[model samples]
Target: RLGARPCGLRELEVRVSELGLGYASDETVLFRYCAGACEAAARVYDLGLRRLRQRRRLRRERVRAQPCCRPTAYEDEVSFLDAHSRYHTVHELSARECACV
Candidate 1:
């Protein structure tokens, strides 16, 4: 197990090799290091399902405050509409109703 400490890319590379790990590719090392750091931070902060629920509540409250149909000030209406359509796509994806079956 890796200890909780600030580590940069170079430090992570050395530590990974010392632990006799194989990198699938150069990107794998960085990916693993980033994942390790994220997991370590979560452990240090005691993050869990309750914290996730609280964050979800806060996000819902924020979205409720900002009414969804409010018009945008940006003049590029075509692009804006295209981008907003993706929000619906995301909603469908979350509901497992993806049309690209």
Candidate 2:
């Protein structure tokens, strides 16, 4: 109710929220903002992905990074999980079992 007033659309929102930020409200402005935000988010995500990869590479080559977490090296097809976390691979004689399907 603060940033932009309700447009009172022809469709209905199944879920309820207090203040909708960007969606159908500003039309052109909202869409432009959403696009910019999407690009920015994608950029940040790319930065993170490359960041983690770089960290892994450094650990592999440089050897300074002792705990190089290769996320791919620990691929859990059943459940994408943390490398240190997940009790894995038909149980590696290690930790917990697959709690989730």
Candidate 3:
């Protein structure tokens, strides 16, 4: 199915076989190049998302771990806003940019 990862190794093998059958001998090289490009794109998307998630998690953990030392209200607001802006920028970039090589 579209967008569904193959369930198992056997299923993936079957899917690959089905895909291979759709190309002619002359088109095989082109098919391979396209498949590789798509795979690279998938990897980029995955890694970008993973990094963004990890950073966000770390930020939350840092805030939670901090002691309740009384900081100036202005300082706390500025720091919070800066972190939020960074999160938004990263989130938008990850969603919109294609990591194509």
Candidate 4:
């Protein structure tokens, strides 16, 4: 899960049987979530993007907060890995919506 949402919903087939938003077979989670991309479906998709952003932010920010990190850094060490430990694993993360590596 990403934040408080699932990891991906794009694989979900969505539709109200009137509009063609289907993407996966019997992936009919939309009916349970209600129809429309502008509605619940879109919100789900948006959340996925947010999740992606968060993980990326987690990566990017770690690099920023500390300039150097050793892969095998100790938890008590003043290294990037140490800095990025759970104590630093943030609940809120941010990056460009369209940002990609």
Full-model lDDT for every candidate:
0.25, 0.26, 0.26, 0.27
Q: Can you list the residue pairs that collide in candidate 4?
A: none
Encode model 3's per-residue lDDT on 15-101: one tens digit a residue. Answer: 222333322222111111111122323455557656766677445442222112221111111011221233111111111112223
Ranking by lDDT: 4, 3, 2, 1
Superposing all C-alpha atoms, what RMSD in Å does each candidate have to the true structure?
18.7, 20.3, 23.1, 21.6
Model 1 stretches with alpha carbons more than 4 Å out: 1-7, 11-37, 44-55, 60-101
Query: How well does candidate 4 match the true structure in TM-score terms?
Result: 0.16
Q: Residue 2's C-alpha lDDT in candidate 2?
A: 46
Model 3 lDDT-worst window of ten: 27-36
Best by lDDT: 4
Top candidate, metric TM-score = 3
How do the predictions measure up, each by TM-score?
Answer: 0.16, 0.16, 0.18, 0.16
Which lDDT tens digits does candidate 2 get at residues 57-97? 43544322122211112112321222344332221211122
Q: How much lDDT does candidate 1 score? A: 0.25
**lDDT minimum window of 10 residues, candidate 1:** 92-101
Residue 78's lDDT in candidate 1: 13
lDDT of 3: 0.26
